[PDB]
Design an enzyme around this catalytic site. Structure first.
Site, PDB file in Angstrom:
ATOM      1  N   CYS A  40       8.608   0.559  -8.144  1.00 62.10           N
ATOM      2  CA  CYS A  40       8.350   0.447  -6.764  1.00 62.10           C
ATOM      3  C   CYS A  40       9.121  -0.958  -6.457  1.00 62.10           C
ATOM      4  O   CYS A  40       8.320  -2.154  -7.096  1.00 62.10           O
ATOM      5  CB  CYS A  40       6.921   0.489  -6.211  1.00 62.10           C
ATOM      6  SG  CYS A  40       6.645   0.568  -4.483  1.00 62.10           S
ATOM      7  N   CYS A  69       6.234  -3.488  -5.126  1.00 59.09           N
ATOM      8  CA  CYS A  69       5.141  -4.046  -6.362  1.00 59.09           C
ATOM      9  C   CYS A  69       5.617  -5.333  -6.804  1.00 59.09           C
ATOM     10  O   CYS A  69       4.654  -6.029  -7.470  1.00 59.09           O
ATOM     11  CB  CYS A  69       5.127  -2.885  -7.242  1.00 59.09           C
ATOM     12  SG  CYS A  69       4.312  -1.465  -6.677  1.00 59.09           S
TER      13      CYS A  69
END
Lengths: 64, 384, 114, 90, 43
Positions: free
Chosen positions: C37, C40
């Site tokens: 992700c 993140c």
């Protein structure tokens, strides 16, 4: 009309439309050798777009 | 429900679009399990998953405010309908949307709530930790009486995601908004973008989305979402099949990537009467489109390896949807002309490609002239 | 002899279970993340800075959703990045946040609500 | 010699002079390159192969032979060389 | 060597029976000219 614009330098086609002719019919890829045939699909080029410049922009503004 | 709202107006061009849901910064909703994790601490390695992504993350979507911002940058006009708290983070989200020239008259403030904050209680049922919601955040608490009907009257496309289906309050509010939009002639755009809970089981998700699916005139789903909704194992088996002795045709020998185009009979369980256009996205690589009259696929491409240190796929799904909405409002023949639809969808492909070249979704959303430039550079002139 | 480069600890669901059931004195901040992700990466750097700011006045941990997917879903994680702020007072309820929130907003939650 | 080597290739290495069905361009390449590099083609085979580089000439040639185009397309997939002695099963 | 370029767009006209077929060093078919051939372009 023409031939008076041409004489004076006023805007006019480079070639007189009345004295303009087509280019008849040319080889249709069946009467042509392989190296002179048009590709069936258009080929990507990286030169496929006209290069932008100052002259193009000013000419359009003067045309309007 | 009863009457109209506002004063009728000549309604400036381009036509307005309304995005409904939660305004969040980043927040990828579609979460599944990937089998190729990087180092848990050294996040400098994590960019290698941006250029070899999980399939569900090839062109991730996001919050509806991403689509509104991306739509405006592509030359459109958009308004966001939703609620934020009266705190400082709420102002920052609204100031972000005002800077991007998104209308925020449809945004309601809740002075008693904290933006993007959910109160939950932790329990220990059957020896396992679980949480349950005590108080929903302001983002998921817009009421029907708080809808801006002037926006719903003016807007020609009403856009929402399936994240609103995870909130009891938003779901009731959503179907009042759809009723108003349809009464005023707006088209309903359902951009699925399934959040983490809705990936648990096909049958529960199909029941949960069925009502909103039936109200939509335009639907965008990813290839992973579509296969999950129909049958995940059948299509995985189909991809993994290899002939035992010889290929059925010369192309099958090349062992190329699978770009399977679903037949309209496979899609039939999901088709309904009011559906005008279904788009299935395989990232930016393929855009399968389905209409009542015809179907086909637009071939696209991607290049994140051209910029390995700034590539970030987050938000590229929103740019594709915004590009579709930009062309649908200005080129209404897209619904009925196949050749026109394919040419206009290539604009959406280009917007998705550029969006993957920058870290951060909002930071990297492309302008209209950049998108049009890339489209003409990538495609041969006969495809423009 | 060489100081470690990362302060935030990665915990299993079982390990996080005992940490919450056990007695705590400082606020507990739990980060759900995944290495695939993109956001993140940004959140990982903010939580490392938050760990430096709150040396022993807070405990910052992280959980990978690739390893603890079922646990994340039961915790009502709807997407990434997601943070849980758990008070040392067992009566107070935890706070779940979604999205790349600013560092100052984390500090206000810890100081005023934890 | 070039009689035992050919026999050795057949028996040991499984050589056979399998027919190669060539396009007009490939047929012209093999007939013309035997003459030189940039020279006037003189052999009647290379001269004819030059003419066959245009499918329009082939259609005119086919019509003068009274056969159809598909029949001409099937005559190029014909086994060349000699035939084996016909079978006599008793 | 010197290359002759077309001065205008148009249609090439000449008698192919006055020239000799050949293959160029680039593998292309062409004609060899041993006379003062007159080639016409109709623009």
């Amino acid at each position: 009309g023409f031939e008076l614009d041409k004489k004076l330098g006023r805007p006019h086609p480079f070639i007189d439309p009345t004295k303009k002719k087509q280019i008849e019919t040319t080889l249709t890829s069946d009467e042509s050798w392989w190296n002179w045939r048009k590709p069936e699909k258009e080929q990507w080029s990286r030169w496929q777009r006209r290069r932008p410049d100052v002259e193009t922009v000013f000419l359009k503004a003067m045309a309007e | 429900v009863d009457y109209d709202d506002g004063i009728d107006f000549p309604y400036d061009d381009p036509p307005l679009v309304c995005c409904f849901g939660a305004v969040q910064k980043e927040f990828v909703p579609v979460v599944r399990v990937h089998d190729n994790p990087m180092h848990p601490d050294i996040y400098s390695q994590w960019k290698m998953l941006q250029w070899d992504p999980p399939e569900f993350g090839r062109a991730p979507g996001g919050p509806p405010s991403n689509v509104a911002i991306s739509h405006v940058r592509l030359g459109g006009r958009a308004a966001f309908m939703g609620k934020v708290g009266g705190d400082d983070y709420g102002e920052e989200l609204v100031l972000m949307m005002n800077k991007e020239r998104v209308q925020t008259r449809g945004v309601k403030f809740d002075e008693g709530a904290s933006t993007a904050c959910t109160r939950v209680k932790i329990k220990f049922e059957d020896g396992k930790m679980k949480a349950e919601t005590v108080k929903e955040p302001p983002e998921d608490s817009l009421l029907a009486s708080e809808l801006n009907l002037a926006v719903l009257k003016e807007a020609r496309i009403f856009h929402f995601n399936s994240e609103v289906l995870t909130s009891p309050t938003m779901e009731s509010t959503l179907f009042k908004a759809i009723q108003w939009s349809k009464k005023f002639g707006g088209l309903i755009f359902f951009d699925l973008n399934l959040p983490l809970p809705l990936w648990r089981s096909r049958n529960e998700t199909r029941k949960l989305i069925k009502k909103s699916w039936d109200e939509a005139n335009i639907i965008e789903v990813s290839q992973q979402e579509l296969e999950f909704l129909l049958d995940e194992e059948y299509y995985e088996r189909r991809r993994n099949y290899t002939p035992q002795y010889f290929a059925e045709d010369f192309e099958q020998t090349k062992n190329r990537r699978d770009y399977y185009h679903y037949t309209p009979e496979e899609i039939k369980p999901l088709w309904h009467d009011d559906l005008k256009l279904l788009v299935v996205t395989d990232g930016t690589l393929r855009l399968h489109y389905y209409t009542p009259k015809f179907d086909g696929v637009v071939v696209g491409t991607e290049d994140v390896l051209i910029t390995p240190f700034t590539c970030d796929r987050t938000g590229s799904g929103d740019a594709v949807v915004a590009g579709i909405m930009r062309k649908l409002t200005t080129c209404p023949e897209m619904f009925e002309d196949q050749d026109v639809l394919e040419r206009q969808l290539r604009f959406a492909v280009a917007a998705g490609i550029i969006s993957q070249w920058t870290i951060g979704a909002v930071r990297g959303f492309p302008t209209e002239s950049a998108t049009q430039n890339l489209k003409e550079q990538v495609y041969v002139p006969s495809m423009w | 002899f060489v100081r470690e480069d990362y302060l935030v600890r990665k915990l299993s669901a079982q390990e996080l279970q005992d940490l919450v059931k056990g007695e705590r004195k400082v606020p507990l901040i739990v980060d759900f993340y995944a290495t695939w992700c993109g956001p993140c990466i940004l959140m990982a750097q903010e939580l490392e800075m938050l760990a430096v700011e709150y040396e022993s006045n807070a405990m910052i941990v992280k959980v990978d959703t690739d390893d603890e997917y079922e646990f994340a879903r039961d915790m009502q994680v709807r997407g990434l990045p997601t943070l849980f702020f758990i008070s040392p007072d067992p009566s107070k309820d935890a706070i779940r946040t979604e999205g790349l929130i600013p560092l100052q907003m984390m500090r206000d939650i810890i100081d005023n609500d934890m | 010699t070039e009689d035992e080597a050919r026999r050795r290739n057949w028996i040991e290495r499984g050589w056979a002079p399998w027919e190669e069905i060539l396009t007009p361009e490939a047929d012209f390449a093999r007939k013309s390159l035997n003459e030189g590099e940039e020279v006037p083609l003189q052999s009647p085979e290379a001269i004819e192969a030059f003419k066959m580089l245009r499918p329009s000439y082939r259609k005119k040639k086919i019509k003068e032979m009274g056969i159809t185009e598909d029949e001409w397309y099937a005559k190029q997939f014909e086994i060349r060389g000699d035939k084996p002695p016909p079978l006599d099963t008793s | 060597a010197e290359h002759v370029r077309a001065p205008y767009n148009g249609k090439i006209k000449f008698n192919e029976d006055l020239v000799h077929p050949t293959r160029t060093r680039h593998g292309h078919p062409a004609f060899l000219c041993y006379i003062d051939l007159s080639v016409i372009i109709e623009s």
